């Protein structure tokens, strides 16, 4: 999914990257042990690939 500005003012955006404390959540909710997110812009961009950390 995506968005770009139409308002012509500047924008401030927030998001999160889930780290369960156990795997049974991870398989139950999302059904992949693989994590891969890619939050992308022109200037900034970054990916996220976590595991469970107790």
């Amino acid at each position: 999914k995506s968005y770009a500005n139409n308002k012509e003012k500047e924008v401030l955006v927030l998001w999160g990257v889930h780290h369960p404390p156990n795997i049974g959540d991870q398989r139950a909710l999302y059904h992949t042990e693989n994590a891969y997110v890619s939050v992308v812009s022109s200037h900034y961009s970054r990916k996220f690939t976590p595991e469970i950390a107790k």
Epitope: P21, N22, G24, D25, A28
Partner: single-chain antibody
Amino acid sequence: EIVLTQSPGTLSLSPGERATLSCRASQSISGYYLTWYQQKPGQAPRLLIYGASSRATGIPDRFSGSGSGTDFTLTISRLEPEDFAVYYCQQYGISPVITFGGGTNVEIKGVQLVESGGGLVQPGGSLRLSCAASGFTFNIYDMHWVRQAPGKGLEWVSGLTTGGDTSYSGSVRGRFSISRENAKNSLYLQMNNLRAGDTAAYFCVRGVREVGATGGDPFYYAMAVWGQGTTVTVSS
């Protein structure tokens, strides 16, 4: 949420036998969406199967199911006289409404909650029930109050998520009112305008781990655990 239909509401079969039971709905409804129970008359219900395949804790291997979409199914590998019981079919609506099959008797041929206040009122009257918790964190789980007439199909009276989204039936709503207390580890159900449709045995029920907490509890979209229930009646 959708009307279900079990298949059959009672059956009579011999030992050393399978038993196929089909709970199917109006619409096609996606499959990690149901769970499956038993109950002995006099005992509270017990949890067996969830999501049309997968199996609960403290178990043999014999009860096993299948099916998808509109037609969900639980089958049985072996029948035994210790299974002499009514089995149920309980589904979490996307409209957050549990819906119930009408119970299925197997006849074989030859931690806890605690309820509070069950009993009599006058019809058109007013009465409250409470429940209370023991040995867990009543914080987390989405709770449900449930009813049952004797040897009848269940009905789901009400339930509430821990962030306040209520769900009732359109008939029962307004006449009942709930309220929850996690610091108390207890629950309340104030009730008014009571007629013979309420003449039934009720149950308090702990359901669903909401998203997040420490624990060695996983979650399903099944119940967690029941209570022993209690009788409530109008009369004169």
